[PDB]
Structures are given as C-alpha cells and as structure tokens.
DNA sequence: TGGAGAATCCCGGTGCCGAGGCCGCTCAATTGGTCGTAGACAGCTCTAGCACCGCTTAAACGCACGTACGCGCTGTCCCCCGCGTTTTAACCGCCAAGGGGATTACTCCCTAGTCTCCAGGCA
DNA sequence: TGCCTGGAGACTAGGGAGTAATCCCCTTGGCGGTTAAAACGCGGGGGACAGCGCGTACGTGCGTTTAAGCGGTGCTAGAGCTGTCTACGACCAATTGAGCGGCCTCGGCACCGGGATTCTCCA
C-alpha cells in the first residue's frame, strides 16, 4: 500500500488536466451563485476560470497540509493539518 | 499648512462618547485609518470606473467599492448611511 | 448671495464633503468625480470612524480610563470580527496584542 | 441543492496526489468540501458584485478574473 | 515618419505604451522617456520568459510553447518565481515534487 | 476590435527562438503577463509621483518602480535595458 | 529557599508582556543594526528618529506574529518547546 | 563602519518577544534563527525605504519612506503618518 | 488540606505635561453662471447561454481484506528554566556644530492641445 | 491582404520643474553618572525523543451502477453596438468662513508607597 499512491503522485503532478469533473463543479457554482442573485447566467469560460482557480487553490492547500503532516511526523494528512495551514496563511 | 482628520474624528467621538477623550497617538492612528480606507475605496472605484470604460466616479462606484472592500454587516451598514446621506443631500 | 451652507451640513454629516471631493479630484482616480460620490464616501468614512470610536471608548471605559490610547484601538479592532477582518494586514503602533494563552501551556 | 457532494472522494484524492500527499484520512474530504465552498462563496460573491455593477445578467470571465485579482489570486490565461 | 519603437531598438510599441500611460489615470503629465523605458522593461521580461519557455520546450522535446512550458519556466527560475508568486497560470499544473521521507 | 500584445511577443520570440511556435492559450498567458507587469510598474510609478509631489512620470519614476517591484538581477538587467533604450532614443 | 516550578515564571512573563505595549528590544542596538543594514545600500545616510521607531514597531510586530505562528506549529507537533523547524515551517507556509 | 550589531538583539529580548507571542518554552537554537529572520526582514524593508529616499534625492530616510516601504509589502503601519 | 513567601491588586497623595478650548486669518470651500461632452436611454442584431434527448463508456461506488501506520505508554537523559551574582552598556541629561530639509523667486523647456496624413495592424 | 485608425511630424503656450540663495530644524557626535539589564554559572526537573506494541483505518483490487461527456437540435435572453439628446460635471470669478497654527490652563494619569487579597509550592 503506497506504490499505487506514489505512482498516482508521479502521474498527476506531471499533467495539467483538470481533476474535478466539469458538470458537478458547474452545478456547484450555479448553486452557490444563486444565494447572491436569482436567474444568473454564466459564460463557459467563467466556469473554466473558477475551476482552474479552485483546483490550483486546493492543490496549494494540500501542499501546505502535507508540510504540516511531515512536521507532525506523519504521512497521513488530517483536518488539523488543513486548519493549521489555513490558520498560518491567514484564512482561519 | 498640513491638514488631517483630527477635528472630524473628535466631533464623531463626542457624538458617540461625550465623556471620552482621545490622545495624540490614537488620533494619529485614526487619521491613518481614515486615509487608508479612503485610498482603498477610491482605488477600487477607480478600477471599477476603468472596467466599465467610464470616466466618472459616481455614488454607484463608491457603493459597489464599499460592498467589495468591507465585510458583510459592515458593508450593509455603510451602504445604509451612504444612501441615507446621498438621499438627504439631494432631497434636502 | 445667500447664506453659505456647507456640503456636509445638508447631507447630515460631520466629515468634510468638500475636502473628500478635493482629495478625489487631485488623486488621479478618474477624469470626472460626481456630486454624490464625496457625500457617499464621507458617510462611509464617518460610519467606520464611529464604529471604531464606539468600541475604543468601550475599551477605554473597561480599563477605567477616560482618553482613548492606541491599546484601546488595538483591543477594539481585534475584538470585533468585521473590523479585525478589515484591518488584518495593519499594525497599530503601541498597540500590543490580545491576551491569549493556549490551553496546552496552562498547567494541569 | 447539495451539489457539494459532486466534489467526490476520488476527485479530492486526485487533488491531494497532485499536491504530493501520499496518505489521506477519511475526514479530509468533508473538510476539503467545506474549504472549497468557502473559497467559491468568496470569489463568486465578488464576481457577482462585479457583474451587478455593469448592470449585466451574465457573469463573464472578466468578472471572475477581477474577483480573483482582488484577493491576491491573479489568474493568467483568461484575460488577466 | 518613423515609429519611436524603431528609434529605440525595441519591438514593443512605444506609442501604444504612451497612449496607455496617458489615459490610465497615472499622472497628469507623461515624460517622453517613460514609454521608451517601459517598453524596454516589458520587452526584456517578455524575452526572458520566452527564453526559459523555449528552453523548457526544447528540453521536453516539443516545438510549441504550451502553458506547461510557461509554468515550468516561471516556477523553475527563482526570481521569476518571486515575481510571479501570487499568480496562477492556467493549464500549467505544478512541479513534480515529493517529500523526501515518502520515498521508498 | 481588441488590442493585444500578441504580435510583439511573436516578434520577440522570433528574435530569440526562430524554430519555436506558441499556442493561443500560451499567448493569452503572455498577454496577461505583459498587462500585469505594465499595470504594476505604472501603478508604482504613479504612487512615486504622488509621494514626491510631482505631476509627471519621467524615466526616473519608471526606474524606481522597476527597482522596487522586480527582484535583484531582473531589476538590474531591466534598468540596463531601459537606460540603453532611453539613451538610444535620445540619440536618434 | 523558595523556587518556582519551571513554567510558572514563564506564564507570568507571558501575561506581563501581553498586558503591556512597550517595545521589547533596546533602542540603541536596534538603531545600530539599522545603521549597518542601511550602509550596505547607501553610505553617508541619515535617519529620522520616527523612521527608526516605525522600523522597530514593524519589526517587533512581525516577530511577535511569527512567534504566534511558531507556537502553533510547535503545539501541532505535540510540544511546548518552540524549535527552529517551527519557524521554518511557519515561514514556509506563509510564503517567505 | 558598523559591524556585528545583530548580537545587540539579545537573547532576553528575543525571550520577551516570544513571551508576547505566547511562547512558554524556548529552545536554545531559537535565537540565531530569530536573528537571521529579523535581519532578512529589516534588509527587505530598509532596501525599499532607501530606494524611496533615493528617488526624492534626499540623504535622510524619513518616517514616510519606512511607512511606504511597509505599505508596499502589505504591512501597513498606523501611527507614523500616511 | 494549610502556612510561608511571593506576587498581584487596591487606595490615597502629588505633580506634570499634554489634551482641549479660545483667537486671528487665510486660503480653500461655497455660490452663481457657462459650456461641452459623458452617459442614459431607445432600438435592433445575432451571439451564445440554456434546455432537452440518446448512448456509451470512463468513472464513481460498494465491499472484502490485509497491512502500514497512528497513537498510547514508558524510560532516560539532555537541555532549558529559575535564581543569584557580576559585568557591561543602555539611558538620560546637557552642549554644541553643522548638514541638509524646507521655502521662495526667477528662468527654460517640454509636455498638453490640435491638424493632417500615412503606415502598422487586424480581422 | 485591404481598410482603418492611431501614431508621427510639426507649431504654439504656459506651467512644471531646475537651480541658486537663505534659513533654521534636527541629526550626529560627545561626556559623565547611574543603574537597569545582559551575561555567566549552576542545580534540577520535566519534556523531547527513541522504542515498542496494538488495533484500526486506509489502500487496493474486483464487480456493479451511474451519470459525464460528446453529438445534435432549437429557442430566446441578453451582450453589444449605434444614434440622440440632455443633464451633469469641469471651470472660472468672487466671496467668506471653517480650519489650522499658536498660546494658555488644568486635570487625567503615571508614579510612589503602604496595606489587603490571591496564589504557588511544599509539609
């Protein structure tokens, strides 16, 4: 257990393709945006920009989370690593 | 020579707390606060005038710059007395 | 000529509408500045100043003091969530910190 | 309603293995979904404000780029 | 009728940068050397990024500059990373990097 | 009729890499990079003119903004290129 | 004789130096440090006293916030002693 | 010529700064790391302050130069003007 | 649980220097009118956003199982905390030289403004 | 590759800055006392760290489901452009009054010192 995980690490870091599916993310954007206005409309490039930004944000957060996990002498990331990284970066 | 928001902050303080004074360093920090928030709102209204290919800053740009900068309840209340002051200026 | 009424008086404001208008015109923010823009901006500046001055007077009264010092401004800004979020990258001179000790350092 | 579940557990694992994470707890996924929802709410609220100022009913890509740009998250490749 | 960009040995347009500086609400007046200097600095930074992007495309055996090559060019140089730290490049990804204790 | 820095990135790329092409998305990234660097240097030079009570932007404000924003060797070679271009422009 | 347990005096200094607002670095050695750092950029330089006080307030606030993040990193590793790897992790996550 | 004034940032001063930050126990290797961090921060701020001084053709670094150098790095300081 | 010592807090007296109020005056806000243009409004086009269907297939999901890993406990020994004493240099007050910031007046030039046309630039 | 539109040449005007003289704020350097703070030393206690065991929770592989995605059709909201006009903001002259600099008083608060009330640690 870990050779397929490290193979997935060496596979996904090299590529630039988006890891979240298109339509569930678009549904999530239209669900979140509905609280601010009713009957909003979205360009497709707007949803693609939101997907690129969200994926880059989550990957940078997981990099800092992994740094916290190695700091606590662990290989498994936990929610306390995420909230510590968000606390230090100023989001929490 | 020099100008500052020293008397207006004192008038606001005596409106709010009639029994409470203020020192020189605290007045200087309040002056820095007013100048900093002025620069933030004016720079955002400049960028919003530039985004819409407009050459005028109006109360609409100041309102949406207040909505962009200030957090939620602060933004709602600041829009409330901004619209109140503009309505009292036009009507009276 | 009639009696000169200031632009702050007819807007019901204490902050100067004309000074804000001059600083907007001379700040190279736009080619034109409207009439309601300095009224709106002076109202917002007066509101934010009054919000800090309420909590700073409360902090000064909690320390049994009369005059507001930078420490009371620090306590007022950091003890209110919206004002701490607005001034998150701001250092108050002679402000200090909130008294905060973690629970794992307190002895059992 | 409840489209945060469309951010699936293998998608969160793909984002973690891109970040270099080798082992993942089972409580990571709900935390990641909440963090993604907070980030999306902030950026989308800013972009909807930028759309409201233009008297427009369509969120363009420019609104998303300026919304990301205000928070220090400048994005190239769309008109930044 | 000679363009000011050819008189400075620059490929970037001096006149377009001067027009953008005039109507950008930066100052009331613009000096004559400011668009020349700004076009030179922009041409230098574009040339540096295109240098490292071409090197990344050549080392990875391709003839086209893609966003992955721009990503590798920006995040591999230290000072370009310091210039573009808070900037995301779309369809660029991240570097292949693994923590040293995770390796077998 | 959109304006872009695309043909000048073509010219600089042909000046440095004759046998290399570029995609549309990579050209969009280069155009956004050029515009972001332009607005950074122009904003810092505008602030430098405002601080020093100058109503004009000369090559000295652009020099100081370039020295403030870019890191070390990039700033040194950028001010070298800018000084060379300004001297050659005044020579012609 | 009477001696306190290790940590009682440290908590007393924590409460004492969190209740106060004074600068915690002596002004003359910080001034000399500012002089030797500024002479590597330009020689024959002078400083206003308000500039040195602004530098000291900024430096002390930066170090206090860094020590708060360092303490969070040390408590994350189930410790009470801050170590240089905590400073390194806090500055790595911050992006410095 | 000034030399080795980073040792004037003493160990009890760093202890006081850590006590303000809520630190209860301090390792003995903290002080050299903290001195290096303080030197890096001061070099970064003082370089832009000196640049702002040199643009004005002045020989004295004023409080405005320090406040603008801190404001350019996202570290706005209230109380010294601006 | 209790007592010695330490530490914290509370209350009265004293001075001191900075908040705060008053006066002059000046320069910047206000008032009234003029003029050009920015923006609001009306109308029309056609791009593109959205709704829906069919399939087909990669991808999500459920589960079974084993092992790597988190986590609790324990020992130990290093290293940092608390305190006492000594040495060092920070700090306060004074005492000037003078260096350079700030102001003012006059002078040059160079950048805004405008007419025309032509060569880059884009679709 | 043809139209188009913004850049270039060139003339004028006047204000933005350059420079020289002046003047005085305030930076730097110095001396001496004093005394607070850093530095050094040392005992001990408690926390960092290595080791071990266990129990469980993720990783992984396989079979089943599901809905993402690609292609295709179609409808219409609304982005986007153009034309017209009009109200709104820049601008200018005159005026005048609010704010700023300076001066002066007095009281909020820092300091000091003694006494009551927690508070920590060891019997």
Numbering used by the authors:
A (entry chain E): 43 to 134
B (entry chain H), F (entry chain D): 30 to 121
C (entry chain G): 11 to 118
D (entry chain F): 23 to 102
E (entry chain C): 14 to 117
G (entry chain A): 38 to 133
H (entry chain B): 21 to 102
What do the study's own words say?
The engagement of a DNA glycosylase with a damaged DNA base marks the initiation of base excision repair. The apo nucleosome structures show that the presence of a DI alone perturbs nucleosomal DNA globally, leading to a general weakening of the interface between DNA and the histone core and greater flexibility for the exit/entry of the nucleosomal DNA.
Different from the previous DI-containing NCPs, the DI in the AAG–NCP–55AP is in a completely buried position with low solution accessibility. Similarly, cryo-EM analysis revealed two major conformational populations for the AAG–NCP–55 sample. One is the structure of NCP–55I determined at 2.8 Å, and the other is an unusual NCP structure at 2.9 Å resolution, with the terminal nucleosomal DNA highly flexible, unresolved in the map (from SHL-5 to the proximal end). In this scenario, the partial opening of nucleosomal DNA gives a short-lived window for AAG to access the damaged site. The binding of AAG to the detached DNA duplex renders this process less reversible, allowing the formation of a stable AAG–NCP–55 complex for subsequent excision reaction. As for deeply embedded positions (e.g., –55 in our study), local DNA distortion and limited register shift are insufficient to fully expose the buried base. Therefore, in these completely buried sites, a partial opening of the nucleosomal DNA might be a prerequisite for the recruitment and catalysis of AAG.
